Amino acid sequence: LQSRPEPTAPPEESFRFGEETTTPSQKQEPIDKELYPLASLRSLFGSDPSSQ
């Protein structure tokens, strides 16, 4: 896709930063509440009528 790159060179070291935000909880999966509407956030993303 013809997008725009903000960072330069494999910048996946910042992604090893949010994993330290007490995301994973002991037992069970509590990452389907606060990281689900997200996934959903890539769903509703397909409803933006280009009307400028």
- Measure the CA–CA gap between 11 and 17, rounded to whole angstroms: 12
Fold of 12-52: 6.10.250
Q: What backbone torsions phi and psi does residue 17 show, to the nearest 5 degrees? A: -125, -45
- Measure the CA–CA gap between 50 and 35, rounded to whole angstroms: 27
Domain residue spans in the chain? Answer: 12-52
- Measure the CA–CA gap between 49 and 52, rounded to whole angstroms: 9
- 19 contact partners, CB below 8 Å, separation of at least 6: none
CA distances from 42 to 16, 17, 18, 35 (A): 22, 22, 19, 11
Q: Determine the 3-state secondary structure of 6 from DSSP.
A: coil
